[PDB]
Coordinates of C-alpha atoms and ligand atoms in Angstrom, one line a residue:
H1 CA 9.5 24.5 42.5
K2 CA 6.0 23.3 41.7
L3 CA 6.3 20.2 39.5
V4 CA 4.4 21.4 36.4
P5 CA 4.6 19.3 33.2
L6 CA 7.4 20.7 31.0
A7 CA 6.0 22.7 28.1
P8 CA 7.1 21.6 24.6
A9 CA 8.7 24.3 22.5
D10 CA 6.0 25.7 20.2
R11 CA 7.3 23.9 17.1
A12 CA 4.9 22.2 14.6
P13 CA 3.7 18.9 16.2
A14 CA 5.0 16.2 13.8
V15 CA 2.3 14.2 12.0
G16 CA 1.4 10.8 13.3
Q17 CA 1.9 7.8 11.1
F18 CA 0.7 4.2 10.8
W19 CA 1.4 1.3 8.4
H20 CA -1.3 -0.7 6.7
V21 CA -0.3 -4.1 5.3
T22 CA -2.7 -6.7 3.9
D23 CA -3.2 -9.9 2.0
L24 CA 0.2 -11.5 2.6
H25 CA -0.9 -14.9 1.4
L26 CA 2.2 -16.9 2.3
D27 CA 2.7 -19.9 0.1
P28 CA 5.1 -22.2 2.0
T29 CA 5.4 -24.5 -1.0
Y30 CA 7.1 -21.9 -3.2
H31 CA 10.4 -23.2 -4.7
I32 CA 12.1 -22.7 -8.1
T33 CA 12.1 -25.9 -10.1
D34 CA 12.4 -26.8 -13.8
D35 CA 8.9 -28.1 -14.0
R36 CA 7.1 -24.7 -13.6
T37 CA 3.9 -26.5 -12.6
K38 CA 5.7 -27.4 -9.3
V39 CA 7.0 -24.0 -8.3
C40 CA 4.0 -23.3 -6.1
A41 CA 0.8 -25.1 -5.1
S42 CA -1.0 -21.8 -5.4
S43 CA -0.7 -21.9 -9.2
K44 CA -2.9 -25.1 -9.0
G45 CA -1.0 -26.9 -11.7
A46 CA -0.5 -24.0 -14.0
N47 CA 3.1 -23.1 -15.2
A48 CA 4.5 -20.3 -13.2
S49 CA 5.1 -17.5 -15.7
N50 CA 8.5 -16.2 -15.0
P51 CA 9.3 -17.1 -11.4
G52 CA 12.1 -15.6 -9.3
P53 CA 13.2 -15.4 -5.7
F54 CA 10.5 -12.8 -4.8
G55 CA 7.6 -14.7 -6.6
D56 CA 5.6 -15.0 -9.7
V57 CA 2.4 -13.5 -10.9
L58 CA 0.7 -17.0 -10.9
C59 CA 1.9 -17.8 -7.3
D60 CA 1.2 -16.5 -3.8
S61 CA 4.0 -14.9 -1.8
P62 CA 7.3 -16.6 -1.2
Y63 CA 8.4 -16.1 2.4
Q64 CA 11.2 -14.1 1.0
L65 CA 8.8 -11.6 -0.5
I66 CA 6.9 -11.1 2.8
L67 CA 10.2 -10.8 4.7
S68 CA 11.3 -8.2 2.1
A69 CA 8.2 -6.1 2.7
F70 CA 8.5 -6.0 6.5
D71 CA 12.3 -5.5 6.2
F72 CA 11.6 -2.5 4.0
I73 CA 9.2 -1.2 6.7
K74 CA 11.7 -1.8 9.5
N75 CA 14.5 0.0 7.7
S76 CA 12.4 2.7 6.0
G77 CA 13.3 5.4 8.5
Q78 CA 9.6 6.2 8.9
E79 CA 8.3 6.5 12.4
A80 CA 5.0 4.8 13.0
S81 CA 3.0 4.5 16.2
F82 CA 1.0 1.5 15.1
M83 CA 0.3 -0.9 12.2
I84 CA -3.0 -2.2 10.9
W85 CA -3.0 -5.7 9.2
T86 CA -6.2 -6.6 7.5
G87 CA -5.9 -10.4 7.0
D88 CA -5.6 -13.2 4.4
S89 CA -2.4 -15.1 5.4
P90 CA -2.8 -18.6 4.0
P91 CA -2.3 -19.2 0.2
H92 CA -4.9 -19.8 -2.5
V93 CA -5.0 -23.6 -2.7
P94 CA -7.9 -26.1 -2.7
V95 CA -9.6 -26.8 0.6
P96 CA -8.3 -30.4 0.9
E97 CA -4.7 -29.0 0.8
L98 CA -5.2 -27.0 4.0
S99 CA -6.7 -27.7 7.4
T100 CA -7.5 -25.8 10.6
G101 CA -4.0 -26.6 11.9
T102 CA -2.3 -25.5 8.8
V103 CA -4.2 -22.2 8.7
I104 CA -3.3 -21.5 12.4
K105 CA 0.3 -22.4 11.6
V106 CA 0.5 -19.8 8.7
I107 CA -1.2 -17.1 10.8
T108 CA 1.2 -17.9 13.6
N109 CA 4.2 -17.6 11.3
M110 CA 3.0 -14.2 10.0
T111 CA 2.2 -13.0 13.5
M112 CA 5.6 -14.1 15.0
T113 CA 7.4 -12.6 12.0
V114 CA 5.8 -9.2 12.7
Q115 CA 6.4 -9.5 16.5
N116 CA 10.1 -10.5 15.9
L117 CA 10.8 -7.7 13.5
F118 CA 8.7 -5.0 15.4
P119 CA 8.9 -5.9 19.1
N120 CA 7.8 -2.4 20.2
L121 CA 4.9 -1.8 17.7
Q122 CA 1.2 -2.3 18.6
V123 CA -0.4 -4.0 15.6
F124 CA -4.2 -4.2 15.0
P125 CA -5.1 -7.3 12.9
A126 CA -8.3 -8.3 11.3
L127 CA -9.2 -11.7 10.0
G128 CA -9.5 -12.3 6.2
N129 CA -11.7 -14.9 4.5
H130 CA -8.8 -17.2 4.0
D131 CA -7.9 -17.0 7.7
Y132 CA -10.2 -20.0 8.4
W133 CA -10.6 -23.6 7.3
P134 CA -12.5 -24.2 5.1
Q135 CA -11.9 -20.8 3.5
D136 CA -14.7 -18.2 3.8
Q137 CA -16.6 -20.3 6.3
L138 CA -16.0 -18.0 9.3
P139 CA -18.5 -19.0 12.1
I140 CA -20.9 -17.0 14.3
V141 CA -19.7 -18.7 17.6
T142 CA -16.3 -19.3 19.1
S143 CA -13.9 -21.6 17.2
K144 CA -10.4 -23.0 17.2
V145 CA -9.2 -20.2 14.8
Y146 CA -10.8 -17.4 16.8
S147 CA -9.3 -18.8 20.0
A148 CA -5.9 -19.2 18.4
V149 CA -5.7 -15.7 17.0
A150 CA -6.9 -14.3 20.3
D151 CA -3.9 -15.9 21.9
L152 CA -1.5 -14.9 19.2
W153 CA -2.7 -11.3 19.3
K154 CA -2.7 -10.9 23.1
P155 CA 0.6 -8.8 23.0
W156 CA -1.3 -6.1 21.2
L157 CA -4.8 -6.2 22.6
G158 CA -6.5 -5.8 26.0
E159 CA -8.7 -8.3 27.7
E160 CA -12.0 -7.0 26.4
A161 CA -10.7 -7.2 22.8
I162 CA -9.4 -10.7 23.3
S163 CA -12.8 -11.8 24.6
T164 CA -14.8 -10.5 21.6
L165 CA -12.1 -11.8 19.2
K166 CA -12.5 -15.3 20.7
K167 CA -16.2 -15.3 20.4
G168 CA -16.8 -13.7 17.0
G169 CA -13.5 -12.6 15.3
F170 CA -13.9 -8.9 15.9
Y171 CA -12.9 -6.3 18.6
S172 CA -12.3 -2.7 19.4
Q173 CA -9.2 -1.5 21.1
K174 CA -7.9 1.9 22.3
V175 CA -4.6 2.9 20.7
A176 CA -2.0 3.1 23.5
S177 CA 0.2 5.6 21.8
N178 CA -2.8 7.8 20.7
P179 CA -5.3 8.8 23.4
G180 CA -8.7 9.5 22.0
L181 CA -8.2 7.0 19.1
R182 CA -10.0 3.6 19.0
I183 CA -9.5 0.9 16.4
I184 CA -12.6 -1.1 15.4
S185 CA -11.6 -4.3 13.7
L186 CA -14.6 -5.9 12.1
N187 CA -15.1 -9.4 10.8
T188 CA -16.6 -8.5 7.5
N189 CA -16.1 -12.1 6.3
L190 CA -19.4 -12.8 8.2
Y191 CA -21.0 -10.7 5.4
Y192 CA -19.0 -12.3 2.4
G193 CA -21.1 -14.1 -0.2
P194 CA -19.4 -17.6 0.0
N195 CA -19.9 -17.9 3.8
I196 CA -22.5 -20.6 4.3
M197 CA -22.5 -20.1 8.0
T198 CA -24.2 -16.7 7.9
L199 CA -26.9 -17.3 5.2
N200 CA -30.1 -15.6 6.2
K201 CA -28.8 -14.3 9.5
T202 CA -29.9 -10.7 10.3
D203 CA -27.0 -10.0 12.7
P204 CA -24.4 -12.8 12.6
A205 CA -22.3 -12.9 15.8
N206 CA -24.3 -9.8 17.0
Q207 CA -21.6 -7.7 15.3
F208 CA -24.0 -5.0 14.1
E209 CA -25.4 -4.6 17.7
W210 CA -21.9 -4.5 19.1
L211 CA -20.7 -2.0 16.4
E212 CA -23.6 0.3 17.1
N213 CA -23.0 0.2 20.9
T214 CA -19.2 0.7 20.4
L215 CA -19.7 3.7 18.1
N216 CA -22.3 5.2 20.4
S217 CA -19.9 4.9 23.3
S218 CA -17.1 6.5 21.2
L219 CA -19.5 9.3 20.2
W220 CA -20.3 10.1 23.9
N221 CA -16.7 9.6 25.0
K222 CA -15.4 12.0 22.3
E223 CA -13.2 9.3 20.8
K224 CA -12.3 9.0 17.1
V225 CA -12.5 5.7 15.4
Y226 CA -10.6 4.0 12.6
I227 CA -12.5 1.1 11.1
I228 CA -10.4 -1.8 9.8
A229 CA -11.7 -5.0 8.1
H230 CA -10.8 -7.5 5.4
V231 CA -13.7 -7.4 2.9
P232 CA -14.8 -3.8 2.1
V233 CA -18.2 -2.1 1.9
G234 CA -19.3 -0.8 -1.4
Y235 CA -19.3 -2.2 -5.0
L236 CA -16.7 -4.1 -6.9
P237 CA -15.0 -1.5 -9.2
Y238 CA -14.4 -4.1 -12.0
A239 CA -17.9 -5.7 -12.2
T240 CA -21.3 -4.3 -12.7
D241 CA -23.7 -3.8 -9.8
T242 CA -22.0 -6.3 -7.5
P243 CA -21.7 -5.5 -3.8
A244 CA -18.5 -6.7 -2.2
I245 CA -20.5 -8.2 0.7
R246 CA -24.1 -9.4 0.5
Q247 CA -26.3 -6.5 -0.4
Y248 CA -28.4 -6.8 2.9
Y249 CA -25.2 -6.4 4.9
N250 CA -23.7 -3.7 2.8
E251 CA -26.9 -1.6 3.2
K252 CA -27.0 -2.2 6.9
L253 CA -23.4 -1.5 7.6
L254 CA -23.3 1.6 5.4
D255 CA -26.3 3.0 7.3
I256 CA -24.4 2.6 10.6
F257 CA -21.3 4.3 9.1
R258 CA -23.4 7.2 7.8
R259 CA -25.0 7.6 11.3
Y260 CA -21.6 7.7 12.9
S261 CA -19.6 9.5 10.2
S262 CA -18.7 12.2 12.7
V263 CA -16.8 9.7 14.9
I264 CA -15.3 7.6 12.1
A265 CA -12.1 9.3 10.9
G266 CA -11.0 6.5 8.6
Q267 CA -12.0 3.2 7.0
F268 CA -9.3 0.8 5.8
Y269 CA -9.9 -2.5 3.9
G270 CA -8.0 -5.2 2.0
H271 CA -9.3 -8.3 0.1
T272 CA -9.4 -6.8 -3.4
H273 CA -5.6 -6.8 -3.9
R274 CA -6.0 -3.4 -5.5
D275 CA -5.4 0.2 -4.6
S276 CA -8.9 1.8 -4.5
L277 CA -10.7 4.8 -3.0
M278 CA -14.3 5.1 -2.0
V279 CA -16.2 8.1 -0.7
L280 CA -19.3 7.3 1.4
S281 CA -21.9 10.1 0.8
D282 CA -25.4 10.7 1.8
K283 CA -28.4 10.1 -0.5
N284 CA -28.0 13.6 -1.9
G285 CA -24.3 13.2 -2.8
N286 CA -22.9 15.1 0.3
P287 CA -19.6 13.4 1.3
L288 CA -19.4 11.8 4.7
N289 CA -16.5 9.4 5.0
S290 CA -13.3 8.4 3.2
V291 CA -12.5 4.7 2.5
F292 CA -9.0 3.3 1.6
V293 CA -8.6 -0.1 0.0
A294 CA -5.0 -1.2 0.1
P295 CA -3.3 -3.5 -2.4
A296 CA -1.8 -6.9 -1.4
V297 CA 1.7 -8.0 -0.8
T298 CA 1.0 -11.1 -2.9
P299 CA 1.1 -10.6 -6.7
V300 CA -1.0 -13.6 -7.4
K301 CA -3.5 -13.8 -10.3
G302 CA -5.5 -16.5 -12.1
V303 CA -4.5 -17.6 -15.6
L304 CA -7.7 -16.0 -16.9
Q305 CA -6.7 -12.5 -15.7
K306 CA -4.7 -10.2 -17.9
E307 CA -3.5 -7.8 -15.1
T308 CA -2.4 -8.2 -11.5
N309 CA -0.8 -5.9 -8.8
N310 CA 2.8 -5.4 -7.9
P311 CA 3.3 -6.0 -4.1
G312 CA 2.4 -3.0 -2.0
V313 CA 2.5 -1.6 1.5
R314 CA 1.3 1.8 2.6
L315 CA 1.7 4.4 5.3
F316 CA -0.9 7.0 6.5
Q317 CA -0.2 10.3 8.1
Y318 CA -2.7 11.9 10.5
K319 CA -3.1 14.9 12.7
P320 CA -1.9 14.0 16.3
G321 CA -4.5 14.0 18.9
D322 CA -7.1 14.8 16.3
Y323 CA -6.8 11.8 13.9
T324 CA -7.9 13.5 10.7
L325 CA -6.1 11.8 7.8
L326 CA -3.5 14.1 6.1
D327 CA -1.9 11.8 3.5
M328 CA -1.2 8.3 2.3
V329 CA 2.1 7.1 1.0
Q330 CA 2.0 4.0 -1.2
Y331 CA 5.1 1.9 -1.6
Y332 CA 5.6 -1.0 -3.9
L333 CA 8.0 -3.6 -5.3
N334 CA 8.6 -3.8 -9.0
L335 CA 8.4 -7.6 -9.0
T336 CA 9.8 -8.2 -12.5
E337 CA 12.8 -5.9 -11.8
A338 CA 13.4 -7.5 -8.4
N339 CA 13.4 -11.0 -9.8
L340 CA 15.7 -10.1 -12.8
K341 CA 18.5 -8.8 -10.6
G342 CA 17.7 -10.9 -7.5
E343 CA 17.5 -7.9 -5.2
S344 CA 14.5 -6.1 -3.9
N345 CA 14.0 -2.3 -4.1
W346 CA 10.8 -1.5 -2.3
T347 CA 10.2 2.1 -3.2
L348 CA 7.8 5.0 -3.3
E349 CA 5.0 4.7 -5.7
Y350 CA 3.2 7.9 -4.9
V351 CA 2.0 10.3 -2.2
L352 CA -1.7 10.8 -2.5
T353 CA -1.8 14.6 -2.0
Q354 CA 1.1 15.1 -4.5
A355 CA -0.2 12.6 -7.1
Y356 CA -3.7 14.2 -7.1
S357 CA -3.1 17.8 -5.9
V358 CA -5.5 17.5 -3.0
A359 CA -5.0 19.2 0.4
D360 CA -5.8 16.2 2.6
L361 CA -7.8 13.0 2.8
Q362 CA -11.0 14.4 4.1
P363 CA -14.3 13.4 2.4
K364 CA -14.8 16.7 0.7
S365 CA -11.3 16.8 -0.6
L366 CA -11.6 13.3 -2.1
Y367 CA -15.1 14.0 -3.3
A368 CA -13.8 16.8 -5.4
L369 CA -11.0 14.6 -6.7
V370 CA -13.5 12.0 -7.8
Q371 CA -15.6 14.6 -9.6
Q372 CA -12.3 15.3 -11.6
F373 CA -12.0 11.6 -12.4
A374 CA -15.5 11.7 -14.0
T375 CA -14.4 14.3 -16.6
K376 CA -13.8 13.1 -20.1
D377 CA -10.2 11.9 -20.6
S378 CA -9.3 12.9 -17.0
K379 CA -5.6 12.6 -16.5
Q380 CA -6.3 12.2 -12.8
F381 CA -8.3 9.1 -13.5
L382 CA -5.7 7.7 -15.9
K383 CA -3.2 8.0 -13.1
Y384 CA -5.6 6.4 -10.6
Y385 CA -6.1 3.4 -13.0
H386 CA -2.4 3.0 -13.3
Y387 CA -2.1 2.9 -9.5
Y388 CA -5.1 0.6 -9.1
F389 CA -2.8 -2.3 -10.2
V390 CA 0.1 -0.8 -8.2
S391 CA 1.9 0.3 -11.5
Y392 CA 2.0 -3.3 -12.8
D393 CA 1.1 -2.2 -16.4
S394 CA 1.5 1.4 -17.7
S395 CA -0.3 0.4 -20.9
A396 CA -3.4 -1.0 -19.2
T397 CA -6.4 1.0 -20.5
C398 CA -9.9 1.5 -19.1
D399 CA -12.5 2.0 -21.8
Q400 CA -15.8 3.8 -21.3
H401 CA -17.6 0.9 -19.7
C402 CA -14.6 0.1 -17.5
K403 CA -14.4 3.7 -16.3
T404 CA -18.1 4.0 -15.6
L405 CA -17.8 1.0 -13.4
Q406 CA -14.7 2.3 -11.6
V407 CA -16.0 5.8 -11.0
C408 CA -19.5 4.7 -10.0
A409 CA -18.1 2.4 -7.4
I410 CA -15.7 5.0 -6.0
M411 CA -18.5 7.5 -5.6
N412 CA -21.5 5.4 -4.7
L413 CA -21.4 2.7 -2.0
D414 CA -25.1 1.9 -1.6
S415 CA -27.5 0.3 -4.1
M416 CA -29.7 3.3 -4.7
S417 CA -26.9 5.8 -5.5
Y418 CA -24.8 3.1 -7.4
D419 CA -27.7 2.1 -9.6
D420 CA -28.6 5.8 -10.2
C421 CA -25.0 6.4 -11.3
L422 CA -25.3 3.5 -13.8
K423 CA -28.6 4.9 -15.1
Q424 CA -27.0 8.2 -15.8
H425 CA -23.6 7.0 -17.2
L426 CA -23.9 3.6 -18.9
Ligands
LIG501 C1 9.3 -2.4 -13.5 O1 10.5 -3.0 -14.0 C2 10.3 -3.5 -15.4 C3 11.6 -4.1 -15.8 O2 12.7 -3.1 -15.8 C4 9.9 -2.3 -16.3 O3 9.5 -3.0 -17.5 C5 10.2 -2.6 -18.6 O4 9.9 -1.4 -19.1 C6 10.7 -1.0 -20.2 C7 10.5 0.5 -20.5 O5 9.1 0.9 -20.2 C8 10.4 -1.9 -21.4 O6 11.2 -1.5 -22.5 C9 10.4 -1.0 -23.6 O7 9.6 -1.9 -24.3 C10 8.7 -1.3 -25.2 C11 7.8 -2.4 -25.8 O8 7.1 -2.9 -24.7 C12 6.1 -3.9 -25.1 O9 6.7 -5.0 -25.8 C13 7.7 -5.7 -24.9 C14 8.4 -6.7 -25.8 O10 9.3 -7.4 -25.1 C15 7.0 -6.3 -23.7 O11 8.0 -6.8 -22.8 C16 6.1 -5.2 -22.9 O12 5.3 -5.8 -21.9 C17 5.3 -4.3 -23.9 O13 4.1 -5.1 -24.2 C18 9.5 -0.7 -26.3 O14 8.6 0.1 -27.2 C19 10.6 0.2 -25.8 O15 11.5 0.6 -26.8 C20 11.8 2.0 -26.8 O16 12.8 2.2 -25.8 C21 14.0 3.1 -26.2 C22 13.5 4.6 -26.2 O17 12.2 4.6 -25.7 C23 14.6 2.6 -27.6 O18 15.8 1.8 -27.4 C24 13.6 1.8 -28.5 O19 14.0 1.9 -29.9 C25 12.2 2.3 -28.3 O20 12.1 3.7 -28.6 C26 11.4 -0.4 -24.6 O21 12.2 -1.5 -25.2 C27 10.6 -3.3 -21.1 O22 10.1 -4.2 -22.1 C28 10.0 -3.7 -19.7 N1 10.5 -5.0 -19.3 C29 9.7 -6.0 -19.0 C30 10.4 -7.3 -18.5 O23 8.5 -5.9 -19.0 C31 8.7 -1.6 -15.7 O24 8.5 -0.3 -16.5 C32 8.9 -1.2 -14.3 N2 7.7 -0.6 -13.7 C33 7.6 0.7 -13.4 C34 6.3 1.1 -12.8 O25 8.5 1.5 -13.6
LIG502 C1 3.9 -26.3 -18.8 O1 4.9 -26.1 -19.6 C2 5.4 -27.2 -20.2 C3 6.6 -26.8 -21.1 O2 6.2 -26.1 -22.2 C4 7.3 -25.7 -23.0 O3 8.1 -24.8 -22.3 C5 7.8 -23.3 -22.3 C6 9.1 -22.6 -21.8 C7 7.3 -22.8 -23.7 O4 8.4 -22.6 -24.6 C8 6.2 -23.8 -24.3 O5 5.9 -23.3 -25.6 C9 6.8 -25.2 -24.4 O6 5.9 -26.1 -25.0 C10 4.4 -27.9 -21.1 O7 4.8 -29.2 -21.5 C11 5.0 -29.3 -22.9 O8 3.9 -29.2 -23.7 C12 3.8 -29.7 -25.1 C13 2.6 -30.5 -25.2 O9 2.7 -31.7 -24.4 C14 5.1 -30.5 -25.6 O10 5.5 -30.0 -26.8 C15 6.2 -30.6 -24.6 O11 7.0 -31.8 -24.8 C16 5.7 -30.6 -23.2 N1 6.7 -30.9 -22.2 C17 7.9 -30.3 -22.1 C18 8.8 -30.8 -21.0 O12 8.2 -29.4 -22.9 C19 3.1 -28.2 -20.2 O13 2.1 -28.6 -21.1 C20 2.7 -26.9 -19.5 N2 1.6 -27.2 -18.6 C21 0.5 -26.5 -18.4 C22 -0.5 -26.9 -17.4 O14 0.4 -25.4 -19.1
LIG503 C1 -26.2 6.1 23.1 O1 -25.6 6.6 24.3 C2 -26.5 7.6 25.0 C3 -25.7 7.9 26.3 O2 -25.6 6.8 27.1 C4 -24.6 7.1 28.2 O3 -23.3 7.1 27.6 C5 -22.2 6.9 28.5 C6 -22.1 8.2 29.5 C7 -22.3 5.6 29.4 O4 -21.9 5.9 30.7 C8 -23.7 5.0 29.3 O5 -23.8 4.1 30.4 C9 -24.8 6.0 29.3 O6 -26.1 5.5 29.4 C10 -27.9 6.9 25.3 O7 -28.8 7.8 25.9 C11 -28.8 7.7 27.4 O8 -29.6 6.6 27.9 C12 -31.1 6.8 27.9 C13 -31.5 6.9 26.4 O9 -32.9 6.6 26.3 C14 -31.4 8.1 28.7 O10 -32.3 7.7 29.8 C15 -30.2 8.8 29.2 O11 -30.6 10.0 29.8 C16 -29.2 9.0 28.0 N1 -28.1 9.8 28.5 C17 -27.6 10.9 28.0 C18 -26.4 11.5 28.6 O12 -28.2 11.5 27.1 C19 -28.5 6.4 24.0 O13 -29.7 5.7 24.2 C20 -27.5 5.4 23.4 N2 -28.1 4.8 22.2 C21 -28.0 3.5 22.0 C22 -28.7 3.0 20.8 O14 -27.5 2.7 22.8
LIG504 C1 7.9 -18.9 8.8 O1 8.0 -19.9 7.7 C2 9.2 -19.8 6.9 C3 9.2 -20.9 5.9 O2 7.9 -21.0 5.2 C4 10.4 -20.0 7.9 O3 11.6 -19.7 7.2 C5 12.3 -20.9 6.8 O4 12.4 -21.8 8.0 C6 13.0 -23.1 7.7 C7 13.8 -23.5 8.9 O5 12.9 -23.8 9.9 C8 13.8 -23.1 6.4 O6 12.9 -23.4 5.3 C9 14.5 -21.8 6.1 O7 15.7 -21.7 6.9 C10 13.7 -20.5 6.4 N1 13.6 -19.6 5.2 C11 12.9 -19.8 4.1 C12 12.9 -18.8 3.1 O8 12.2 -20.9 4.0 C13 10.4 -19.1 9.1 O9 11.4 -19.4 10.0 C14 9.0 -19.2 9.8 N2 9.0 -18.2 10.9 C15 8.3 -18.4 12.0 C16 8.4 -17.3 13.0 O10 7.8 -19.5 12.2
LIG505 C1 -11.7 -12.5 -4.9 N1 -10.7 -11.8 -5.6 C2 -9.8 -12.7 -6.4 C3 -11.3 -10.9 -6.6 C4 -9.9 -11.0 -4.7 C5 -9.0 -11.8 -3.7 O1 -9.8 -12.3 -2.7 P1 -9.1 -13.4 -1.7 O2 -9.3 -14.7 -2.4 O3 -7.7 -13.2 -1.5 O4 -9.9 -13.5 -0.5
LIG506 ZN1 -6.4 -11.8 -0.3
LIG507 ZN1 -9.9 -11.9 1.0

């Protein structure tokens, strides 16, 4: 007779879950035709290799492929309280074949697709470098694209997020279904090498100042933060000594993340179209923060490349009310199989804790895994290299130089530690 909240039965609180999808790269031109140089504009005159209804390795995504990915999510039976979506919706075609209006039209199509299929799901998007015309030229002041995506994403974001999105293409947002969790969606395309608009700027769009203030507020308000962005921090795992964003920005952003590692419970990136891990550590090798690079839905590659990825989407599990990451489930589409029979079978690729026999996704757990990778002929690393391409090629091999680059980039996000790793292991 005193209106006290009803106590839940002391069962185990189910884990929380969220989806991460990235790099959809819709090619609206995709159509099967006898002249394989006309299957898709994204192959740029090359012959599609073996095209089917769900795509080709030399093409960006048919609409049917993207629809199959989101249909899989919708029908998966997995509960999820939100989704993160880290950008890159238009296809890889020459600048004159696009325009601002065409870019906005593709992002609108992808946004409405998600909203139609998932009417009750809060989605946290970030912009990719292709989400602007010309590609990679994302500005440091408001623009038509920023204003358009701010309008498109209003169903998911509050007024303050909309206002920063419109001005600079970034925002933070409290997660409605998850009190105490805030998403910080950065515009790391401001730091991407090809961006002429940010050359020699110390703090383009004031994003560093805003990020520091946001994290400081989260720290004092006892929030936890998930960082999402398109281009990741750290070093390319397939090239030597090449930061993914300009070195000046990589060093500055990493220093902010080290300072606020106690608040940041996850970092989630796209852009590479590969499945990669990184572990941010301090200068002495003590692990601080776990980083998860998710592979793309598009399978596209250039003619020059030997390997590509199968389409992928992924699910994270986390501790409710606490937001510590517990697991990651990677799903994929075997594109060759799907095209041969004409029917998609999105399926489990792996569960991280089971694949690698780790307890959870905390920095110390993953740091110990990466130390295993470093051992000669590590079977853990062989598995990881297979998953890097989302199981595209079980016979792909990683020679000594290849592996040094991979492991050094997983373990060492800043220039000093990365170069020291090269010194010791080249
Ligand atoms: C996604 O789905 C695709 C399609 O089903 C799978 O790809 C097929 O995988 C099978 C088995 O792994 C392949 O069949 C095997 O091919 C081997 C030779 O492979 C090389 O040469 C072929 C030549 O056509 C290339 O296509 C290929 O890329 C390789 O470079 C053979 O050695 C195998 O023969 C053995 O099989 C049995 C017993 O093992 C016996 O009958 C044989 O005598 C011999 O012992 C076998 O034929 C098949 O070629 C692949 N198809 C395609 C189109 O690539 C992927 O595995 C799947 N992905 C995942 C992650 O599961
Ligand atoms: C794109 O492919 C066409 C077709 O190539 C043929 O078809 C494939 C299935 C494979 O069997 C190839 O070895 C074949 O040659 C290419 O056009 C052909 O190229 C040569 C040189 O001109 C000639 O023998 C054919 O007559 C050409 N045309 C046709 C209709 O066969 C074309 O060169 C390829 N384009 C690119 C950019 O690679
Ligand atoms: C980081 O934040 C602290 C705390 O600021 C407060 O945080 C919230 C309660 C919010 O209500 C803000 O308005 C508050 O100001 C900053 O330290 C405070 O501000 C100055 C620091 O020189 C000092 O006079 C206050 O006493 C500090 N308050 C407390 C509780 O310690 C700190 O400076 C911020 N850092 C940056 C870089 O912004
Ligand atoms: C997103 O774009 C796709 C096509 O790129 C749309 O799907 C097609 O829509 C037109 C009809 O208007 C036709 O080509 C087909 O009927 C549809 N399917 C395919 C595979 O092309 C889709 O409707 C768009 N969605 C939104 C929300 O704009
Ligand atoms: C640049 N890349 C080809 C290595 C990765 C893909 O990047 P993006 O062109 O989709 O932005
Ligand atoms: Zn991309
Ligand atoms: Zn990109």
